[PDB]
Amino acid sequence: RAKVAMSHFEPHEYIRYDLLEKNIDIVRKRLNRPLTLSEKIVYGHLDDPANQEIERGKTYLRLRPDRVAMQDATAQMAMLQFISSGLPKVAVPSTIHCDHLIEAQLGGEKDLRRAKDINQEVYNFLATAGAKYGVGFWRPGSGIIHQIILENYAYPGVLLIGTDSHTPNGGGLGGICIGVGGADAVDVMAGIPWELKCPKVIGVKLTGSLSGWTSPKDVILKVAGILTVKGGTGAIVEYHGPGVDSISCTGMATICNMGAEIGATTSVFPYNHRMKKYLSKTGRADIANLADEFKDHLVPDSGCHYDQLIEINLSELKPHINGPFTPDLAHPVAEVGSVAEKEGWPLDIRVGLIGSCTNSSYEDMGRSAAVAKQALAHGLKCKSQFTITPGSEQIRATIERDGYAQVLRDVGGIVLANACGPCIGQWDRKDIKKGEKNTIVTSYNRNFTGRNDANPETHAFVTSPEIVTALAIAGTLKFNPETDFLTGKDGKKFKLEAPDADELPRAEFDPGQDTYQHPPKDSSGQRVDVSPTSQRLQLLEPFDKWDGKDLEDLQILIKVKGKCTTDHISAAGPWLKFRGHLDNISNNLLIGAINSENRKANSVRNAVTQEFGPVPDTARYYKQHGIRWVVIGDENYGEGSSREHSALEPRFLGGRAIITKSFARIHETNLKKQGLLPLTFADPADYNKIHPVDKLTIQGLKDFAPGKPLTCIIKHPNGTQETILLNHTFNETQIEWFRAGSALNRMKELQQK
Ligand SMILES: O=C(O)C[C@@H]([C@@H](O)C(=O)O)[N+](=O)[O-]
Ligand code: SF4
Numbered sequence: 001r002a003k004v005a006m007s008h009f010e011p012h013e014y015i016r017y018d019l020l021e022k023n024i025d026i027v028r029k030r031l032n033r034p035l036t037l038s039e040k041i042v043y044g045h046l047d048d049p050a051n052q053e054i055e056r057g058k059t060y061l062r063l064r065p066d067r068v069a070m071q072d073a074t075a076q077m078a079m080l081q082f083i084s085s086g087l088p089k090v091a092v093p094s095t096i097h098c099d100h101l102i103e104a105q106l107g108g109e110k111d112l113r114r115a116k117d118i119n120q121e122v123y124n125f126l127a128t129a130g131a132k133y134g135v136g137f138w139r140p141g142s143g144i145i146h147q148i149i150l151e152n153y154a155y156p157g158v159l160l161i162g163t164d165s166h167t168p169n170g171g172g173l174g175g176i177c178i179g180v181g182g183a184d185a186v187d188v189m190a191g192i193p194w195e196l197k198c199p200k201v202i203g204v205k206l207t208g209s210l211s212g213w214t215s216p217k218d219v220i221l222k223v224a225g226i227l228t229v230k231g232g233t234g235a236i237v238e239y240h241g242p243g244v245d246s247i248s249c250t251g252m253a254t255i256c257n258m259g260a261e262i263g264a265t266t267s268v269f270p271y272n273h274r275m276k277k278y279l280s281k282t283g284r285a286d287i288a289n290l291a292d293e294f295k296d297h298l299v300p301d302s303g304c305h306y307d308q309l310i311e312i313n314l315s316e317l318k319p320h321i322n323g324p325f326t327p328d329l330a331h332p333v334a335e336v337g338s339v340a341e342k343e344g345w346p347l348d349i350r351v352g353l354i355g356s357c358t359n360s361s362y363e364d365m366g367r368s369a370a371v372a373k374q375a376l377a378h379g380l381k382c383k384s385q386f387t388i389t390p391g392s393e394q395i396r397a398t399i400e401r402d403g404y405a406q407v408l409r410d411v412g413g414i415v416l417a418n419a420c421g422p423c424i425g426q427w428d429r430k431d432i433k434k435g436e437k438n439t440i441v442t443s444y445n446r447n448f449t450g451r452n453d454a455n456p457e458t459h460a461f462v463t464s465p466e467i468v469t470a471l472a473i474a475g476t477l478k479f480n481p482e483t484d485f486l487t488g489k490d491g492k493k494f495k496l497e498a499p500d501a502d503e504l505p506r507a508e509f510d511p512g513q514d515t516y517q518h519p520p521k522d523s524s525g526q527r528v529d530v531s532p533t534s535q536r537l538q539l540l541e542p543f544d545k546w547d548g549k550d551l552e553d554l555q556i557l558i559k560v561k562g563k564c565t566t567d568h569i570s571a572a573g574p575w576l577k578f579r580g581h582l583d584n585i586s587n588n589l590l591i592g593a594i595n596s597e598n599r600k601a602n603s604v605r606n607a608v609t610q611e612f613g614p615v616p617d618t619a620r621y622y623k624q625h626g627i628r629w630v631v632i633g634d635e636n637y638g639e640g641s642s643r644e645h646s647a648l649e650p651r652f653l654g655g656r657a658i659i660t661k662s663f664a665r666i667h668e669t670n671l672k673k674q675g676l677l678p679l680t681f682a683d684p685a686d687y688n689k690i691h692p693v694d695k696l697t698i699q700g701l702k703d704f705a706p707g708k709p710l711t712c713i714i715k716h717p718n719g720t721q722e723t724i725l726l727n728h729t730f731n732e733t734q735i736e737w738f739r740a741g742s743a744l745n746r747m748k749e750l751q752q753k
Pocket of ligand 2: 144145164166355356357358419420423424445
């Protein structure tokens, strides 16, 4: 066919649109109906298109991803599991991106230099494991993972998996990009088929066109308020309609990115001329030309059926700001000042932060600079503190060159290193005391309790970078940039003009400094050293195989009330220091979750001593004394980040099962991967029958089977017993993970010993 390389770094790995076409055609001969775009790319990557059972929402698909991307907070545990497998080399193109361990403190270069000293052990481990197993490595300072992927690796029709829940960002270039836990990436790097429950498809028809202050971020802030944080669970969101051509390629990536906050499996846009333009400007005109020849397979079929359809008129959309503690509490910017006032949310904005993978593009920096130059023209600077994260080294070099960085510095901003930084709590914040009630507004995507600064009383609102810039200039949530007046130096009142900016540099991008490190694909005689006394890195010891018995008289470690995100289960911020050390990071287990017994975080009754104390300490006491335990959870347990540490930590501290009203997808898959039992109530009202004092017997594990419920006997202290049924979504592949003790244990059994 054509021999067009997958990227500039892998000149030998060719795009296989011929394979894709071939597979799409096998499947449509079987289904005899129009396929959506996500169905074309997902079913086009089936390991066995001829025999795979395909029912949306019901069958598990065995897929062959094109490439794997990992960032340094999840790559450490994915590579320690890969090192346990004993396999010598990764089977598909794979990269590690170092973006999570650079703490915001001093800004830019000084923070990068410090992170390189402080995190030397970890960066060394990843570069060495990368050289040994054939994984490309983007050095600290390269940029945030999803911006490097859009710029170098994502292309129309790719199926990419990344160990990060915002991997859907790549949907802005027409690929299917899906977030997974480190153990799922091990399957694909190992070469074994990856399984994914066949998605439902929600279609979002965009009409009209964006005007003025409304930006791509407002489309997904509105969709999140409509669908709620659990409304996209088990579905791919497919954007289509005449309004699509009004959005830049990084704008489409912004909308796909935050589809993660409604629990969607991923989001995608059809190949179009804005994508083509972005591919040409990033040195991939040959890939845009090839995609032009295969265009039919890169847009939806005429008349395809969406399981749910939502229509959004871009022309009537207004600026939104979402929060404070959920990203789906959606307010128009024009009303947030009054809802805050009524609700007791602090009205002054202490810090305005632009960045994260969701909004750190060249265009986002240009639109922020366009608001800021107007303030500067009237002798104003930011009333709030203001920080700016460029998404990649290329964007940093180019916004510097094209003058936007100096405008943002002159209004009072501090440019931070090209890294997550304050978005996962890597921020040495000292303007507030812990527990001080305050408001920050960000262009990020999540605003979960204590995630940005570990202060549970910080009220964080997420919005677009141009609205963060306008609110930082005013310093108060009571400011609508569309209607209100600022007062210049000169005494005149003036109004902010809606920002206008180029979506891409007029000249070419400036690449900035060299930050990619190709594997020696020669040498690979690297020994990966993990010191046995390391506090940051620890080799894994396998979990125990299932004993063949039912689980009786299980202790409830904690019955959780309400929202319980993976940031409540395994906090980030200061704990990122231990993402390669299981025993040390297990000390944060469930410290943010609210206990229904007393409505406190990190305070549970130890059943034996009858003292209330920290959840990790109590779990370790139960483990020490042979008491097997359970967590009881409410709805959408495990919402958020893909960090498999939220599943590895309960396994390690002696947990057996997590029984909830519902689970978020990636967390439920991670629980099964680590040999725990994720179970849901067959009647959610049964959550109210279980009291923290009850003991539970899960019965029927001997004939554990797809589609058959398990019985749970609730043993009340007064002698009363009640029996309830619990559902599971295990297929026989996954029951083998549970019988072996983990998926990694099962994989190692299949290596003939
Ligand atoms: O905890 C992690 O490292 C992965 C994660 C992170 O980038 C996050 O935003 O919480 N995520 O979203 O998947
Ligand atoms: S959401 Fe924040 S922490 Fe996660 S990859 Fe994006 S910028 Fe980094």
